[PDB]
């Protein structure tokens, strides 16, 4: 079905379904369904548009979205990269930030093992 | 981090220096050795010089730099590539 921008799956229990939005994990999913009063052992196939409306209401009332989340990620990163912080310097260099290894590992942030 | 209940680490030396500066209501360059002090927005116009193991670096403070320690803005390691 359609929602805040994720073309939802079909054979996925709702706890699994909601998680395919950028702003949700299983914790928030279960919490939302508890607030909504609808079971989680259902299918998008047997889903109701009124229930979709309830879902939309709760999430847009008490949670942020794709755009807000990605904008805010950019906001923190542009903040700490323009104010001259150590974290921001590492973000510029494409390097780990939390005090990790640089000598050997950290190919997840350096890219694949291009040989030198 | 320095948890809420304890309150921040705003060390007494430069606390006293800034008390002097804001009681005179004029703001000047300051030299300090304390990376470990976190920030209040009282410092926004104040200017600090901070040590890199080697020398000092005068640096000006800003609104959004609060919640941080000054050593975040003092570069410790030079690296230039290969």
């Amino acid at each position: 079905a359609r929602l805040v921008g994720v073309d939802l799956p079909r054979d996925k229990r709702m706890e699994i379904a909601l998680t395919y939005i950028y702003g949700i994990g299983r914790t928030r999913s279960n919490e939302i369904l508890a607030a909504t009063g609808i079971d989680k052992n259902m299918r998008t196939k047997d889903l109701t548009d009124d229930q979709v409306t309830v879902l939309r209401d709760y999430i847009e009332g008490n949670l942020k979205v794709e755009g807000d989340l990605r904008r805010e990620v950019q906001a923190d990163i542009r903040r700490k990269i323009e104010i001259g912080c150590y974290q921001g310097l590492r973000h510029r260099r494409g390097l780990p930030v939390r005090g990790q290894r640089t000598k050997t590992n950290a190919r997840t942030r350096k890219g694949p093992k291009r040989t030198i | 981090p320095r948890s809420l209940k304890k309150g921040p680490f705003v060390d007494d030396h430069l606390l006293k220096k800034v008390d002097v500066q804001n009681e005179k209501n004029t703001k000047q360059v300051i030299k300090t050795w304390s990376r470990r002090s976190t920030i209040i927005p009282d410092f926004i116009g104040h200017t600090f010089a901070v040590h890199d193991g080697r020398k000092h670096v005068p640096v000006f403070v800003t609104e959004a730099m609060v919640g941080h320690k000054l050593g975040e803005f003092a570069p410790t390691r030079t690296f230039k590539g290969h």
């Binding site: - | 809420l4 309150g7 927005p41 609104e63 609060v66 919640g67």
Partner: peptide
């Protein structure tokens, strides 16, 4: 940015 509220949470 919301530092006035940061140092209401921090006191």
């Amino acid at each position: 940015g919301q530092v006035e509220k940061f140092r209401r949470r921090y006191g």
